Amino acid sequence: TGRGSSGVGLTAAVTTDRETGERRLEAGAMVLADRGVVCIDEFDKMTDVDRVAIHEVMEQQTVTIAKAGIHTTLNARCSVIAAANPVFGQYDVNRDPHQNIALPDSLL
Amino acid sequence: PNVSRTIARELKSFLLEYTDETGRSVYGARIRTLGEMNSESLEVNYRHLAESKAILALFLAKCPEEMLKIFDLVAMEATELHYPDYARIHSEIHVRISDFPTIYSLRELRESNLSSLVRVTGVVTRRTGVFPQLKYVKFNCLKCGSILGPFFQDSNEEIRISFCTNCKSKGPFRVNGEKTVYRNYQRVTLQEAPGTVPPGRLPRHREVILLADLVDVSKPGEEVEVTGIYKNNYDGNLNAKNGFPVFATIIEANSIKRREGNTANEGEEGLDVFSWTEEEEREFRKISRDRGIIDKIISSMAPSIYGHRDIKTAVACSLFGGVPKNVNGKHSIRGDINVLLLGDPGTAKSQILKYVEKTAHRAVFATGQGASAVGLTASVRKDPITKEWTLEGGALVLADKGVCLIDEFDKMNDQDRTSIHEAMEQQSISISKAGIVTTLQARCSIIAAANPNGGRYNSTLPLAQNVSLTEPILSRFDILCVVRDLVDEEADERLATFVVDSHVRSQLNARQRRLQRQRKKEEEISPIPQELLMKYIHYARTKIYPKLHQMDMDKVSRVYADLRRESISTGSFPITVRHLESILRIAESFAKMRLSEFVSSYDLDRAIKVVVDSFVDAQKVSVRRQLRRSFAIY
Amino acid sequence: NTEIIKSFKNFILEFRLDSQFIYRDQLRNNILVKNYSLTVNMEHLIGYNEDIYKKLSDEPSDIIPLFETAITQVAKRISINSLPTFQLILNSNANQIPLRDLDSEHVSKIVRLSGIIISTSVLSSRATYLSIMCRNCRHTTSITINNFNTGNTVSLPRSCNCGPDPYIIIHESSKFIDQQFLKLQEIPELVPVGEMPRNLTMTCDRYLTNKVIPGTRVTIVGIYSIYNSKNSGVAIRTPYIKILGIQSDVETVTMFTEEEEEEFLQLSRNPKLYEILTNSIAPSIFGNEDIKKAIVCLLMGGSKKILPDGMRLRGDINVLLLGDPGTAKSQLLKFVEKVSPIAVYTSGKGSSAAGLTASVQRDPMTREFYLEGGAMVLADGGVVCIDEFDKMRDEDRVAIHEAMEQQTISIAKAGITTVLNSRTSVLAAANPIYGRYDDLKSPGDNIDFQTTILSRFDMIFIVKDDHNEERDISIANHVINIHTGNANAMQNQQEENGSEISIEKMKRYITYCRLKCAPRLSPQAAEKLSSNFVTIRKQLLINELESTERPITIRQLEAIIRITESLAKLELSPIAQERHVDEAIRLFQASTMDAAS
Amino acid sequence: ATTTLTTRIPTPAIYPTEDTEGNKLTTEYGYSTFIDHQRITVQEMPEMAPAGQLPRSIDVILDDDLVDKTKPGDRVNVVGVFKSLGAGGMNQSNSNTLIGFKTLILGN
Amino acid sequence: ERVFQISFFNLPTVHRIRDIRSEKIGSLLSISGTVTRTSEVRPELYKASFTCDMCRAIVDNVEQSFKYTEPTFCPNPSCENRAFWTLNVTRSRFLDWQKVRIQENANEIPTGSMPRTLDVILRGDSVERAKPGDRCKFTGVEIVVPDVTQLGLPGKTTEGLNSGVTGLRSLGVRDLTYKISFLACHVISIG
Amino acid sequence: LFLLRHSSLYDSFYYSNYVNAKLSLWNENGKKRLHKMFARMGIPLSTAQETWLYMDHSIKRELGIIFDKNLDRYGLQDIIRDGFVRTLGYRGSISASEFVEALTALLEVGNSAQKLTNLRKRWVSNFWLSWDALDDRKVELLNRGIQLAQDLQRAIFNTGVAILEKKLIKHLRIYRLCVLQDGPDLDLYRNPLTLLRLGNWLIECCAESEDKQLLPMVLASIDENTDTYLVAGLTPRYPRGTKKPILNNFSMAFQQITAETDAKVRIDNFESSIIEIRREDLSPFLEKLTLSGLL
Ligand SMILES: Nc1ncnc2c1ncn2[C@@H]1O[C@H](COP(=O)(O)OP(=O)(O)OP(=O)(O)O)[C@@H](O)[C@H]1O
Ligand SMILES: Nc1ncnc2c1ncn2[C@@H]1O[C@H](COP(=O)(O)OP(=O)(O)OP(=O)(O)O)[C@@H](O)[C@H]1O
């Protein structure tokens, strides 16, 4: 539902000790997205820390992480569907059509 | 031994046979009255504390507790002749000790201090709840009799043995489940309150183990002081530091009193004695049936300020207050009255708010910066490692009948003002951030001391031009008391001659003789001094409830509405459904001080002629015309 | 001892008042449809039962189930083997010492509490009938564990001639009971000085579990026994309640008696309901007729379509009240809270709007991340109420955009991503930019930047301040009658008993009328609203060419159809008509004009 | 606790040595048989559970024949036996407020 | 009612904390430095009269050393010895102390080289006299301290490699390690 | 101390102070003095169905062994009484002391010249639901009057304490006059059966020594139009010492004032101890009464 806690494409090293001596990189949200589709909302109503994550997963099919453990390149075939809203009401026609949301053009 | 049997006999007469201060039987009065509430408490009078101490101090510091266990069983037989049959009703009393001559605090505890009476202060930090305590250990053998009597267990020492008086084997002593009464047990850890302390350093920690009838007297956050003993029981196992020949302290408390203030006394105001029975209550009636009292009382409140009348009248009204009155299955009614002082930088507005803080029973003084929106009301302090997100209050939930301050923290004005104007509107407010959705109760009172940007008449233009507040938060109050002076010869000396005489106000007989000197020095005009004046306030707020009539109330409806019309047709800020609810309330605050439950005619006109002038005088140059209006109202 | 058993099997097969023979006449009725439970009634049970309780007060924790063995031996008399044991449910009512006298004289005595239940745990199991094997000697026995002193009433011994502790718990022939550890909270009104409320714990049996939802008034009667957990000073234990019977108030899952609905149908045929509620809802509110009608339709709602495709419509309405201080938008909101079936009241400062909907934290056991908290998940089926929609800009708007309009959230925090259901209904009451200037300027300056929240709510009232010299004096005549004298409490009690409706009658019939009928509007109305909108948009269209901007879009046009469906739930008619719908637009046509002026 | 039905006397042992002879015991691991063991928690289908609670969960032990079949996020439908295990009330003494009857599903 | 102590002061030579190894055991060595992170005031024992309640528990035993929770020498009558003890609070005088950490001065630190430190017990009237935050001097008796691994709930580095030799005492086989610490008698603060 | 076996040793606290209103007070000493004899036991919620039903027989004995030593010393003999009781086999023990109390209150509540007709049709109708109270068939309506009764006294005592503290009783010369001009809850004074009880409470506030002027009062109240004013008189009372023949003197005077001018005076109510008056006639009423000494 696009609630943008850190976990949208990562693990955050959640292991829960897995019965005293097993550490597991638990799959957050990309094991479900593989050869499928996702959808997230409210892009401009987000913090910074999700936007750096959507940079990586778009330029590259994979995430690779080493939080307190193992570097691992796990693969992902994803396809986002976006939904955002303009800022200043009905101001699209009397100004530039561009910059109308002014989220970074790294994604545009 | 056996000579202590005579000691109990010798002190018992040494207690009840004598009463100080011209008789009237003081010690016989404390006992029968705390029988009538059935609440298990006694005291020690101050003037014969020391004479009961002088031949008993060497039998205080030598043994403080076993003297008390034999001190207790005489107080049964003290009241037993007076009230019989305190056996089927809870069968238990234990004494308490009043104030003691000792100043010191947590920094000074030596080995010479232990196993003795100690008095110390601090702040109560995070506490636990109430559990039951065993306190009477019935021991259980397996083969022989499993009933060894309900024992006399100690404090946290876990007293047990292997084998005695049944056999010598390793059949362990166990439990069974009948006729073992339980007391309660509430461990409050204590931090040193950062008041009288050489600053720039850390707090220090202790432990307090309460007793049965002393449970949950304090709250998590005020300052207290305890009158405990100094028991040092531990086996010698410790685990934050290594094992060593070291012992840890445990203060078992004996009594508890509240936040004290103005620590300058010598023979009084050290205990909230608050017992008004034969002489005091007979006196409090005949001080209430006089015909100039509310004219005398409000002149007698602020002892050291020669100012104009109305501000004293309103600040008399604020701590008196009306009624949080009940209602059926419908909306409740605000039982609080909240005033606002507008002043000049240089009149005495900062002092009347200070002076009422002592004279009230409970208070708080959140002033200036640091008033964070979460900080006043409740907050959620996070958990330790095996704990849960609990709920810790701040200012308001402590201060049920007290004081805050909002003058002009201009940057932090938009931060917290959205948390105090919903304390009156949505009265009894609480919140649900990241936790539980509850709602506490807080029928608090607000006073404030706002400050215009520069001078008091920064404009002929109205109050919305003068203050930086907007309308709705301003509209919660009852009256905007405003001050003024430009130039006056005779009025200035009436302050100037007044203020200089105040700076001129800078062993059993002698302890009494200093008191009459302390009594005469307040009695230059004798305006009913503070030795008795605060004492009837506390039951003027918890014992009397006023009611109204009908035949005299409707005469002010046109006096409201035709004044509502002139104020709406000509208005800076408007009156609404709000103000009239304060009109009837500050009326009945006055009649609450006649101690009489009724509302008269003599008060409604007095209550009106407080509000109307104090509204209209803040308007403009166009005020001389409105004074031609109000004498028709009078 | 025994023989008490003979004092009760010879007591419940004959206790009666005058020729009704009641307890056999309900146990027979209770062995049939499977419940296996009892109740007790009045005084002689009390009259001689104290004469049994003068030998049961010593331990009402082991000879309470000595009742329980008896009624099975009267049960088999009404059979002629598959026979379970029974349970007990009690009743007593004198008062409610809330949370004060709780250690001195109240260990193992019968207590009565009034509280608000907040938190349920997941279910569990303890056994009541076991089978036991010695290891190398192979003894077989069976022990029953009925009532408790939490675990370990008795233990398993060493005697089978085989080795020490040779005993094991098979799972082939076993029965089980379930416990709860639901948490109880003090009702927040009874002890105010300066304190914060405390909390206890309790368990129960299966044929009285799952009978409470969090957020209700409740009363409860039971024991005050003591367990001792070994996960702090001397050997101290903890308190808990062992409950017996919840003779609660209503649930506030639609089963009830029939004489309730008889009067309801006798009232619903009298066609004066729409006007008589507006006087009888708020007995403390001067008039305000346009606003008052918006509240009764908000409380009941419309419907929900799961129509044979994928998508769905949202069957709900959400109102706003913005206006000057001193126009009773505040104290009106406490009034909807008690009358609602389920209501919360979080009306202040947002309360960390990210932690309004969901919270996750580390765990004391197994160090895990599971879902615990929320303001919305508690409040489903009913209505929330919040305020101050000026000075919250942080997260309050970004938290309600998803929570409204589709009512389907999913938390994407470190653990789960689950779409939990939501069917909520919101309500708000803000302030404009000090009121008067927004009614003395260009009609902008309401929300600081964005109107996108304002398109998401349909109904908006804009109250104001008049100066009519005859309506104030009546109001000044009104509130002194309601403040002191309480004469209208005698007046409204006099017009109650034949004409008006009190508060406890309104609540019970709303949950009945919502949960029975399912309306639909008639296709004759389809021509009516279509002809209505084209000039409504045109009345807006003539305003934009005059360089007047802001907001009306099409959510309101699909909101009027829920509004006309609302009074169809009130009349409980399975259609909708034209005198039905013309009064409906008469509420909204009035609120279209104030959207312009 | 894997035979699914019979509560036999357990063998609290990992590996024995020195059978009743003077021969150093050797073990053939090619002729020693193995099996796997995997637990998985199942939430509630969050549409048909009515709105008065969060989703609950129980767990299921399956065997080799249908492992790695369960991607997280599948509408699964299992069927098995209902089963309790574990000693509740005797394995520690005084045993106050500790359930000792874990719900399990040993299914197919 | 009489309890004393011996307070030397003013030896000539003043060392630094990096010069304390071999000859410095049982010596007297004045030490400078600065102090940080005090602690509170608890009591010590040095002598008890605990004894077992076998026949008579009035044996004033000896040897209140670093593991002194067992008075078990020379019982009064021919009774059962080391069967119990009852540490009464009524007859054994105590003495009060606090444990503090010190640190090296600022005009001697060669580089920023994680400036090392040690700990010190002060036990007489020296209590609450070292205000934390001053350039301070000390008495000088150096001392080692073990842990005896008492009856409590428990019993990177190759620490205790010395202590592997320290096994096989008459009580249980473990490894008793050591650490150099400090006992003082008399404080001064010139500065 | 009444209705105890039915219930409320709680609201006994009021009408224990009624009994102390028979002694020397109405609130002052008793609200201390009651707290030797009463809160000795905190009064429960569940076993109080058993303790002040059953083992108050340990406490009725205890009052029986309290007031025997309050007998040669206190000597106040308004408490111990012989009385009478009945039972139904089950359904609790109900005596006849409290039973007449339920019948009075249930007769009260339980519901030109156009208002008096719709007032007179009420009292006949609510009479009728009391006459059928003498079957076993009324059980759950029997307790309805019971819970009605223990608020009506709490209602009537709520205003009796008001008119005392107003201090509007004036001993003019012969009687004392009180006019309840307006207070709260005036509706419960149309039906005259409450008024004799209000006097029954008011005749006992003045049941101290009063060794001169043992004369009862005349009250006044109004709820309805044209000042109907159902004025009434009481009887003087004896503190259990009737030797003098004190029946009534007012009805002799009630013939006199009714015979004078017929200027809107009414005796249409049945009992002669109650009449009506006009507002402008009550002030010349008393002037005719302060001189016409007919006792
Ligand atoms: N009328 C007065 N009588 C006696 N003392 C006065 C009077 N007016 C001012 N003072 C003295 O002047 C001192 C200065 O404090 P003052 O009350 O002026 O602060 P203030 O201007 O009220 O402060 P703030 O503006 O923050 O409220 C006070 O300590 C007070 O004793
Ligand atoms: N129309 C009305 N009818 C009856 N009572 C009213 C009405 N408007 C206001 N009141 C009364 O006002 C009293 C106090 O309400 P209050 O002054 O808190 O309103 P408010 O919260 O200030 O209004 P707002 O929410 O606009 O700020 C209540 O007792 C209520 O009875």
Residue numbers in the entry:
A (entry chain j): 433 to 540
B (entry chain i): 201 to 706, 737 to 864
C (entry chain l): 24 to 103, 130 to 198, 201 to 211, 235 to 305, 319 to 339, 346 to 643, 647 to 693
D (entry chain j): 217 to 324
E (entry chain m): 260 to 414, 428 to 463
F (entry chain h): 326 to 436, 462 to 591, 597 to 650
Excerpt from the paper describing this PDB structure:
The structures of the C-half of Ctf4 and its human orthologue AND1 reveal a disc-shaped constitutive trimer via the β-propeller domains on the N-terminal face (N-face) with the three C-terminal helical domains interacting with up to three CIP peptides on the C-face. We sought to address these questions by a combination of biochemistry and cryo-EM and found that one Ctf43 binds CMG very tight, not dynamic, and can bind 1, 2, or 3 CMG holoenzymes without steric hinderance at a 120° angle to one another.
Cryo-EM 2D averages of two CMGs bound to Ctf43 show the CMGs are held rigidly, consistent with their stable binding to Ctf43. The 3D reconstruction shows each CMG interacts with only one protomer of Ctf43, and the CMG contact is limited to one side of the Ctf43 triangle related by 120°. Hence, the two N-tier rings of the Mcm2-7 hexamers – where the dsDNAs approach for dsDNA unwinding – approximately face one another at an angle of 120° and the C-tier motor rings of the two CMGs, where the leading strand Pol ε’s bind, face outwards and away from each other. Notably, in a factory complex with two tightly bound CMGs, there would still remain a vacant CIP site in Ctf43 for binding of dynamic partner proteins, such as Pol α-primase and other CIP factors (see Discussion). The protein complex consisting of 26 visually observed polypeptides in this > 2 MDa factory model give no steric clash among them. This model may explain why Ctf4 has evolved to assemble a trimer, not a dimer, in order to tightly coordinate two CMG helicases, leaving one Ctf4 protomer to bind transient CIP factors such as Pol α-primase. Our dimeric CMG replication factory model suggests possible coordination of the two forks that arise from an origin of replication. In the core replication factory model, two parental duplexes can easily be engaged at the N-tiers of each CMG due to their 120° orientation, and the lagging strand is deflected off the top of the N-tier ring after embrace of the parental duplex by the zinc fingers that encircle dsDNA.
